[PDB]
């Protein structure tokens, strides 16, 4: 019949840093999930058929409208499968994002992320930059909050989900993962991969998979499979046939 | 979850040329079943049946690709009256060999319906070594696939071609042009140009090979000539197959 799903990422597990966190290395991302958007049958079968491909990564945010509130009911049953990634400190109110990294909305919105997603703890909090790294991780509450909400047991490491090589680096000295980027178009964040392998630290890359040029994915993902230091790839695909292949070329890739 | 195979070509078939026969903008290769790895007897019933749901209809083989023909027959019982077959004569232990004879093109022809399991097949293109322009005029092989056209036999007739100028030769008389065209060989354009002046049929080999996807990239270029009908893939990779027809329906909008 349909066996189709031959390749899947089941074996390939690694480590996220030295969090004790084991993820496949691809994530689903979940911004579409709140933003066409996925129909509540749609959004189960993509996060089932995701776990028969081997994924346990899972990616969102206060900001991805609410793909929150949404994962809590659809991951009944299922939560303790997941490793979940979610941010703090972009908000998108009426027309535009919004930031904020008091201490105050810090952990007002890890207590609603908490809420919403039906569980009393999430695997890995990153901080939601507006591009000026450094100086939130500097000047603001945002990081020491969450190095408390990680003590309490609310959160279980936390790190920065940054668009500057020196932000990623900071976030590495005192927090536990970097999010960055890095495709076919964009390295500059390399040193920041380097550095992670460097010291058992978690990086996880966003937009892998965009381009200006012997699949595009399947360059992709050698370019940044290549780099020893990266844990994960988050992919954003809502279409199970896209998914299932992106997932093979992942595993091609890795050989 | 067992539809992602979402998007499928069943209401984009296509009339190829006058024959009166309506096909799928691909159709399916079978040259790795039976090998100028080879799908398992299993492997290849999966590939069939995910054509099929995937709205495709035609099927290219030929006497030269192995056991491809001796193989199918066995695997399209139950199913023939849904498929479209095209095959070939001409090409035959190391090497090729080639005979254009009249007694060789009706014993090949005999031997294709016996292999199949039918009385019949759509489709029958002369296997050119490249010296199209002289087999069509100086062997037997063409005015004999006119014959066995008339005895019923064999539905319509071509060349699967070479060179510009045997194509065109093909469609003068016969039925129906095979005709390389990709992203790197486009020579063959003016046979499709002619083909579609003259309600007259086109099948695109090699679709696929080159030097934002490259496979839609492809089909775009191939379905922007309106005289093409069908492009064959080879493919037996059962997602690889899903995703060409994705990127083929998306082509043709």
Same mark, same amino acid.
């Given at each position: 019949?349909?066996?189709? *799903?031959?390749?899947?990422?089941?074996?390939?597990?690694?480590?996220?840093?030295?969090?004790?966190?084991?993820?496949?290395?691809?994530?689903?991302?979940?911004?579409? &999930?709140? $933003? #066409? *958007?996925?129909? +509540?049958?749609?959004?189960?079968?993509?996060?089932?058929?995701?776990?028969?491909?081997?994924?346990?990564?899972?990616?969102?945010?206060?900001?991805?409208?609410?793909?929150?509130?949404?994962?809590?009911?659809?991951?009944?049953?299922? $939560?303790?499968?997941?490793?979940?990634?979610?941010?703090?400190?972009?908000?998108?109110?009426?027309?535009?994002?919004? &930031?904020?990294?008091?201490?105050?909305? #810090?952990?007002?919105?890890?207590?609603?992320?908490?809420?919403?997603?039906? #569980?009393?703890?999430?695997?890995?909090?990153?901080?939601?930059?507006?591009?000026?790294?450094?100086?939130?991780?500097?000047?603001?509450?945002?990081?020491?909050?969450?190095?408390?909400?990680?003590?309490?047991?609310? *959160?279980?490491?936390?790190?920065?989900?940054?668009?500057?090589?020196?932000?990623?680096?900071?976030?590495?000295?005192?927090? +536990?993962?970097?999010?960055?980027?890095?495709?076919?178009?964009?390295?500059?964040? $390399?040193?920041?991969?380097?550095?992670?392998?460097?010291?058992?630290?978690?990086?996880?890359?966003?937009? =892998?998979?965009?381009?200006?040029?012997?699949?595009?994915?399947?360059?992709?993902?050698?370019?940044?499979?290549?780099?020893?230091?990266?844990?994960?790839?988050?992919?954003? #695909?809502?279409?199970?046939?896209?998914?299932?292949?992106?997932?093979?070329? =992942?595993?091609? =890739?890795?050989?």
């Amino acid at each position: 019949f349909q066996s189709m *799903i031959r390749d899947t990422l089941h074996d390939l597990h690694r480590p996220l840093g030295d969090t004790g966190l084991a993820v496949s290395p691809l994530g689903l991302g979940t911004v579409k &999930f709140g $933003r #066409t *958007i996925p129909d +509540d049958r749609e959004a189960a079968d993509l996060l089932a058929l995701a776990r028969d491909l081997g994924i346990n990564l899972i990616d969102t945010a206060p900001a991805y409208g609410r793909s929150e509130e949404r994962l809590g009911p659809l991951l009944r049953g299922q $939560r303790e499968h997941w490793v979940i990634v979610s941010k703090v400190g972009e908000e998108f109110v009426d027309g535009q994002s919004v &930031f904020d990294f008091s201490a105050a909305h #810090t952990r007002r919105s890890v207590e609603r992320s908490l809420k919403r997603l039906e #569980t009393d703890r999430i695997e890995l909090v990153l901080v939601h930059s507006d591009g000026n790294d450094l100086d939130i991780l500097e000047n603001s509450e945002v990081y020491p909050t969450l190095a408390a909400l990680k003590r309490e047991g609310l *959160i279980g490491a936390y790190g920065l989900s940054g668009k500057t090589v020196e932000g990623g680096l900071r976030a590495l000295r005192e927090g +536990d993962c970097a999010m960055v980027t890095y495709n076919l178009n964009e390295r500059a964040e $390399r040193p920041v991969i380097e550095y992670a392998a460097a010291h058992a630290k978690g990086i996880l890359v966003k937009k =892998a998979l965009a381009s200006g040029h012997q699949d595009p994915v399947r360059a992709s993902f050698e370019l940044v499979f290549d780099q020893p230091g990266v844990a994960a790839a988050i992919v954003g #695909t809502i279409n199970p046939l896209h998914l299932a292949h992106n997932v093979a070329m =992942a595993a091609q =890739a890795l050989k």
